[PDB]
Amino acid sequence: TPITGKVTAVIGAIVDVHFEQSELPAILNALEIKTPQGKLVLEVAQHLGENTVRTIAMDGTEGLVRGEKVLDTGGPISVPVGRETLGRIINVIGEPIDERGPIKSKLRKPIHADPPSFAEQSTSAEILETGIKVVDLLAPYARGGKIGLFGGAGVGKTVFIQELINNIAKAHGGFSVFTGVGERTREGNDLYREMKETGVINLEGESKVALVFGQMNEPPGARARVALTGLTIAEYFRDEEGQDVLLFIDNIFRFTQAGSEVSALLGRIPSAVGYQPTLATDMGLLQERITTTKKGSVTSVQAVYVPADDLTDPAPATTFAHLDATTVLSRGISELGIYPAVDPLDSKSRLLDAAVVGQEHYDVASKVQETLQTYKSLQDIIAILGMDELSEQDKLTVERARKIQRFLSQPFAVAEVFTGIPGKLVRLKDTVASFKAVLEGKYDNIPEHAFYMVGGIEDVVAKAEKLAA
Amino acid sequence: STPITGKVTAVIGAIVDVHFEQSELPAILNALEIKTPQGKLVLEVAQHLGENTVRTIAMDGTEGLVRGEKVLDTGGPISVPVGRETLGRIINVIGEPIDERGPIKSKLRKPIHADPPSFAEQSTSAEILETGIKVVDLLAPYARGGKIGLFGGAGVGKTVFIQELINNIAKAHGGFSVFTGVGERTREGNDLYREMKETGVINLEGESKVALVFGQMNEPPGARARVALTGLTIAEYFRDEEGQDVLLFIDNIFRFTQAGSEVSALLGRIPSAVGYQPTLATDMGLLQERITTTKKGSVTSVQAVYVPADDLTDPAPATTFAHLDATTVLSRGISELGIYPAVDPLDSKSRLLDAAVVGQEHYDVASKVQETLQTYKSLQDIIAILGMDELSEQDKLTVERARKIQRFLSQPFAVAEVFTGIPGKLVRLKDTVASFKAVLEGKYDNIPEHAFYMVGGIEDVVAKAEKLAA
Amino acid sequence: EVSSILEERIKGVSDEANLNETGRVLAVGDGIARVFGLNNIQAEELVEFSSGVKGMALNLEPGQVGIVLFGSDRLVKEGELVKRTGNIVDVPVGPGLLGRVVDALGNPIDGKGPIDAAGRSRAQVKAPGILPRRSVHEPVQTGLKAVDALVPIGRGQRELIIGDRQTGKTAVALDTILNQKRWNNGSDESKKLYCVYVAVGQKRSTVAQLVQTLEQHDAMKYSIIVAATASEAAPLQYLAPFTAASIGEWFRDNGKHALIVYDDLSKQAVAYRQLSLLLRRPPGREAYPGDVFYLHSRLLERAAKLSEKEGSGSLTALPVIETQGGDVSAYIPTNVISITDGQIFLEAELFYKGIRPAINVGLSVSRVGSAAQVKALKQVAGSLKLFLAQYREVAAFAQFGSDLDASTKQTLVRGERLTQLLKQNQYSPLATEEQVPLIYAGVNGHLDGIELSRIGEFESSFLSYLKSNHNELLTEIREKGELSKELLASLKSATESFVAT
Amino acid sequence: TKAQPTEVSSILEERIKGVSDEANLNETGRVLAVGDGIARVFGLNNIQAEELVEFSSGVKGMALNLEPGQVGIVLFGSDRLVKEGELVKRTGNIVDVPVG
Amino acid sequence: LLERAAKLSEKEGSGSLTALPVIETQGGDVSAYIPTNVISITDGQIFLEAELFYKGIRPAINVGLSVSRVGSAAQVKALKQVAGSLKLFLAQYREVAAFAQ
Amino acid sequence: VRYEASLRQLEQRQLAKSVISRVQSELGNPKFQEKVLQQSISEIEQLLSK
Amino acid sequence: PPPVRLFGVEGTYATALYQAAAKNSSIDAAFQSLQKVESTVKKNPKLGHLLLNPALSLKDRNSVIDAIVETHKNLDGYVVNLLKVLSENNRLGCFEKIASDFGVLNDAHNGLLKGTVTSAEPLDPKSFKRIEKALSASKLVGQGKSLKLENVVKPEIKGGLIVELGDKTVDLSISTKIQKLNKVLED
């Protein structure tokens, strides 16, 4: 309805309106504040009594004067979905950033929505292969599954995702969504440029990717509902086309931190550390709107910046509940010059319990974990003393584990330039063979530099001859 | 009592605000009663907020509590019935059974809040007591006017130890005892009740050699806090007016501390260091002080204490540690090795444990024992890494002795017929002091290390060697 | 048409209010409503907001009454009326909730069939007393040798599963369900669990993968999944354990037995945390409420075994606590450790190492005596408890790289063999009757005579062997649950004969 | 708008009725409310910080915080006989102990 | 702050405002809130070590804790040939000097 | 199949939009006066019943 | 006498003032005079609307108080004393707050009640009159609480009417039916 108002207060980015007429909008409606700066879009979050709302402000807050018109949209703002949203970059509202002019659409739908129920959930364990050796060994990915990664600051977290885009988005889905929530200007520009280079966007045509981008610069409120916009483009594909989708995020951390910012002022007395109490529910909804229905199927890959190298903090911790696989990456292990930076004793999957993706495969992955852990237990011992002050049997075991460590280093074929080593792809069937050999001591003689930066077993072998040169 | 009306205004959890009428207002620590079909809800008055407004903390169910519902003032602090028929039955906070032996008959009545006796009354005189357990007897012997403190883990064999203590000493004594459970499990309550009905300490005749006062954990914190106080007042009534020694028991007093932490926050108080209550100190000082040896009776409190997560440098256990005169630690390791009871020798200490007061020989041997074990413990690093084969013949002999004594701390208990499954032993205070000298003087190093394990006196230990040989 | 029947039903409904005191909303949002009015309110009532929402009330003030809304919050607003329902909260309890996923209000979120209510109960129903109780003495089975022999769990008690985030947490629960399926089918009614599993703070997706796993193994005929997923409201999440529990109490009352797994009690403290800071009530230790401990305490004590003059059934509790790093000196893990009589510590390392779900054989205690497991299995594991305790000590000395006594190394070699035997893969049941041989054999140095590698194969062959040749020995262990001079001798004699094949 | 929570109801009926303090409530103070072992008295304006005050419940206190509408005494005696509405005489000799 | 420094496109005149924000970190912490927040906005590192600094070299950069991702096509070919895989070679030296000593 | 199950949902939203179209007809007319009155007389009956 | 507290927002001034006015002998008069002085303070044309919020001292306000009682010397002696309290504590925006809350106290002692009967359009005069008849007739109003039936037109109610007065409401609104109707026909 058109409900005009005036601005009673402007406290921070949590502005308050006083609606002058007895007509009064519900919670999660959108409002437009008119100023000579253009529109400011706000969202109703509390009613404080005697027709006075308190609004989260989802656009900047400078140049605002108390006693100025408000207008009620009549509901949450509408982003644009369709087949004619493909090959586009869309803001928090549906505005071009790619600037190929206004966006043609069929149905434009609101940012917020209710999550599909437990009876509408229908979840498969059908697999997906990548072509990365490490992935295949430790915790497979699946179609219907939600996969998680807990990347570094911004020194190896992106490179990993870019390799993933090239394998998964060209071997599955008819659609793909990239939503980049509070990312940096350099990241967005690299990804758009790259997509059009690799022919994943045809502007004249209809593309297989759509894009949602929103700077890290933008105020706290705006960054949260970048995440919401992207989630809507995925909901149109899952429901209305009814086809399998994909979703990629790099990073979803921006969501949690945004929520913790708006939280303190509103009335919600923060929980310890500084993070919000409403974390589990706010996050929760989003993670049940990213899910696989009996219509389409949203396979998601989500990348989470760990804050100060503590995954104990409330924000990374509550994220792990909504993941049926994780492959946790330590910041340290990135600094060491070891890429991929995934920890091998801190990876887990519900998509490999004890025989789920082939018994032979599970048994090979199990032994690898036991060996690797032995070596970590003896790290203390090796350092404090020597290593020639131990038995010959423990030394074999250590030397084998040290090989498995170095083997895990596999160069990337998207960021191949940067690494300095031309890339590699290793199938699932190859992965099994390569590790089979390594456990049985069929290649416990060749150098421990031969293993670093190579994919498959055969390449270690060849590399020995190059090193020998 | 008399018609006095206040009307409820706000129910904010345990906290209930009432609006008493002018010139007939309450006082701090009074008892308010509100009729409900959930018994009589008693509200402990804990603040006055002015405007004729009292603010109270709850003890009893506050579910479906209708606001405006008239609130009577009894006129004083919760008042129980006390006597000699407190004995042999279970009683909750309000002085009313939860074992349903009907209205307990009153001799005297008192409030459960009372003052502790001032310095003019307070004296330190004590008579050494025998638990029938060797470890306690050598290394931390009990005394009258006990402020004893049984620090240990949960389910480390801690329950088993208290049970035996009641079984030997309570029945034997001409004195009575009062067993009080603060915010503890109904599983434990039914098993403790049942187990001791057979062993006879709870006689089926009205008069008995122990009492039970159970305020339990599924009940509101206000009631738990002042379950400890109920038990303690029963003991004071014995102490003066029927002029006799008793032995109080409370289990765990860590529940008193936990119950006090929850209602500090609700009255509005901001947390102290490690989240505890501010009034931990003043609260302890009033509880501990009532338990002493007057110029009438005596109260020998033996209190079970739980150390959360095996960390006892937390200010709540650690401040309390001084205030408990005969600290004992029953640690988890010792339990795991098979060694029962779980008593650690070094960290078991008492007010009276040195001089001729506990006898010269006891101190002398007890010092020789602590030292023998402390050397072996320093040498554990050395036996592991360095080897104990380039260390002396004397060092080896001290180690063999330490091992012989270590395996001579073990014995079974009579309450352990399904905790061990072998009936108890009674090894009296002189017998133990005599047996441990023998091991040290070198007289019994022809007894194997394993032939001390699970036996009584030296007479028994020598005999268990005969048996092992065939 | 579907519409017509639905329109006809809507049509025959008449509104007409009548209530003890109305009130008009005045603040709302942040998940938590606050209404102006309502001065005659009783504690814990349900008051129906006119939006289509219902919310129970936990704060009553002569100013602003604090009604925590269930579900929606984005159609609730200020200007609206709220009307007291005139009912304190209650849930349908009955044999119609079997094989159905149900939320905290007891309506099916799955639609596998309608709720048959043989009663209604209240979410808060007061825990059992001292008088009703009867001592515990009835075995509970995971089909895992370590759980059963070291930390035995009875019926009418509570023993605590503690560990890291999603480290085999599902597995523990399923292991218990699976080996007790055999007994469910069986002849004794007093050996059959109608297990109830509670899921607080987890996504819809994990539960939906679980149900699938439960339907392949045909243990979903008797299983109940009470759920309050991430998406569904913060009050329903606090509310989920208390209403899962009334349904467990009903089995116990009828003479039937059940076991209620409560996942996560940590996530209930988080829900209650949300409530308390938005009704501005001072928190206790570590930002979690200053009366949280009371919440877990009244609940856990509803697992109870009663006398035959009341129920011949018993409710059993399995609490679950998930650490946010590992820490057990935290107020919410501290609070729970107090309440139970056991710890079943799950180590991070041992999970990878081969014991899955992993039970730590270091720190872990079971306060209960060992008649809470079958009598045979206790004897064979008589010295098992010492053997593990010695293996750790010896082992630690052993790790430096120093060489020591040959006697020390007998204990070192023996322990290794027991741990490997203990390892067992997740999702496999294995009856007690056939756990009796394997632990006697290990203790009796029959499994130390053979090499470390071939221990799993030898175990598998040994049991196959016993079904064919000595099937009498097994029948007795299944039927009577003990061993005597004749049976022990036979077991010792039988093992030696087939000691390595 | 501009108000104190030392505008308490027993005081406020007296100010309205033209009933002025008259040095009973300036000299001398009288308890408004007593909570948490923190008696809050109206009066005591001629007191020295930490000066000794004597209750009509026989309880002694000192006055560590002095504040304009209430003076926050700290109890030395117990809380049991201190209840709201109590006369609080000002002893008018700050805490001193015999020396010799 | 940081996103207000950028390399504009050919259109806006080929804009640049190159930011090298200078961070005072005590303990060479990368497990503390403020360092990791900075690192997450930025790309690469220009790490500087106390130890290397004392031991000759001013200013002394630590190659094993330096990474660049935003310069790895900035350099022209002259400065590439001469510096053939030297970044790699001193990450062949890094392994060597762990167990050399 | 997926189109049919969706078409049954479209049929569902069509009679949902029909509820709105009838509200504008009913509140336009003096049917807005004549059925309110019908409630008003029932309102007497209810309140006398208290 | 206090009649039991009402309000949390500045109703302590109202309780006290009420009891001070029973000992005065008239509450009706007190209330009436305040109502006419409050109304001419608000409806000041200069700095009664560009100044209602505190901005001036305790002392500057006292000289404005001397001018207020010059406009009406009639206010009795206790309700003149109530102005000193407000000036001293320097409250002014809650000047009308206390007077309305007092009003609630007066008009309870009088045995009057106010009923609002929200509608979607102005109702028939007979509709009111029958409702009034019904409530007097019934046990709802016994006399001592004589109602004012106040119709309001609101966009909050479309169709129907909703009766309100006291602690009793009867809702025969249409809106509730439409919401539910919508919900069930999207399945």
From Swiss-Prot, chain B:
GO terms for biological process: proton motive force-driven ATP synthesis; proton motive force-driven mitochondrial ATP synthesis. The modification Phosphoserine is found at residue 335. The modification Phosphothreonine is found at residues 74, 199. One of its GO terms (molecular function) is proton-transporting ATPase activity, rotational mechanism. Its main location: mitochondrion. Belongs to the ATPase alpha/beta chains family. This is ATP synthase subunit beta, mitochondrial. It comes from Saccharomyces cerevisiae (strain ATCC 204508 / S288c) (Baker's yeast).
Swiss-Prot record, chain C:
One of its GO terms (molecular function) is proton-transporting ATP synthase activity, rotational mechanism. InterPro entries: ATP_synth_asu-like_sf (IPR023366), ATP_synth_asu_C (IPR000793), ATP_synth_asu_C_sf (IPR038376), ATP_synth_F1_a_nt-bd_dom (IPR033732), ATP_synth_F1_asu (IPR005294), ATPase_a/bsu_AS (IPR020003), ATPase_F1/V1/A1_a/bsu_N (IPR004100), ATPase_F1/V1/A1_a/bsu_N_sf (IPR036121). It is found in: Mitochondrion inner membrane. Disulfide bonds: none annotated. Signal peptide: none annotated. The record marks 364 as: Required for activity. Gene3D superfamilies: 2.40.30.20, ATP synthase alpha/beta chain, C-terminal domain, P-loop containing nucleotide triphosphate hydrolases. ATP binds at residues 163-170. Changing residue 248 to D: In ATP1-2; growth-defect. The keyword Membrane applies. CDD domains: ATP-synt_F1_alpha_C (cd18113), ATP-synt_F1_alpha_N (cd18116), F1-ATPase_alpha_CD (cd01132). One of its GO terms (biological process) is proton motive force-driven ATP synthesis. Present with 41500 molecules/cell in log phase SD medium. Belongs to the ATPase alpha/beta chains family. F-type ATPases have 2 components, CF(1) - the catalytic core - and CF(0) - the membrane proton channel. CF(1) has five subunits: alpha(3), beta(3), gamma(1), delta(1), epsilon(1). CF(0) has three main subunits: a, b and c. This is ATP synthase subunit alpha, mitochondrial.
From Swiss-Prot, chain E:
Changing residue 42 to I: In ATP1-1; growth-defect. The record marks 66 as: Required for activity. It is found in: Mitochondrion inner membrane. F-type ATPases have 2 components, CF(1) - the catalytic core - and CF(0) - the membrane proton channel. CF(1) has five subunits: alpha(3), beta(3), gamma(1), delta(1), epsilon(1). CF(0) has three main subunits: a, b and c. Mitochondrial membrane ATP synthase (F(1)F(0) ATP synthase or Complex V) produces ATP from ADP in the presence of a proton gradient across the membrane which is generated by electron transport complexes of the respiratory chain. F-type ATPases consist of two structural domains, F(1) - containing the extramembraneous catalytic core, and F(0) - containing the membrane proton channel, linked together by a central stalk and a peripheral stalk. During catalysis, ATP synthesis in the catalytic domain of F(1) is coupled via a rotary mechanism of the central stalk subunits to proton translocation. Belongs to the ATPase alpha/beta chains family. Present with 41500 molecules/cell in log phase SD medium. This is ATP synthase subunit alpha, mitochondrial. The lineage of its organism: Eukaryota, Fungi, Dikarya, Ascomycota, Saccharomycotina.
Curated annotation (Swiss-Prot), chain G:
The keyword NADP does not apply. InterPro entries: ATP_synth_OSCP/delta_N_sf, ATPase_OSCP/d_CS, ATPase_OSCP/dsu. Pfam families: OSCP. One of its GO terms (molecular function) is proton-transporting ATP synthase activity, rotational mechanism. GO terms for biological process: proton motive force-driven ATP synthesis; proton motive force-driven mitochondrial ATP synthesis. Keywords: ATP synthesis, Hydrogen ion transport, Ion transport, Membrane, Mitochondrion, Mitochondrion inner membrane, Transit peptide, Transport. It is found in: Mitochondrion; Mitochondrion inner membrane. Its main location: mitochondrion. PROSITE patterns: ATPASE_DELTA. SUPFAM superfamilies: N-terminal domain of the delta subunit of the F1F0-ATP synthase. It comes from the Eukaryota. Disulfide bonds: none annotated. Signal peptide: none annotated. GO terms for cellular component: mitochondrial inner membrane; mitochondrion; proton-transporting ATP synthase complex. The keyword Membrane applies. Belongs to the ATPase delta chain family. Mitochondrial membrane ATP synthase (F(1)F(0) ATP synthase or Complex V) produces ATP from ADP in the presence of a proton gradient across the membrane which is generated by electron transport complexes of the respiratory chain. F-type ATPases consist of two structural domains, F(1) - containing the extramembraneous catalytic core and F(0) - containing the membrane proton channel, linked together by a central stalk and a peripheral stalk. During catalysis, ATP synthesis in the catalytic domain of F(1) is coupled via a rotary mechanism of the central stalk subunits to proton translocation. The gene is ATP5.
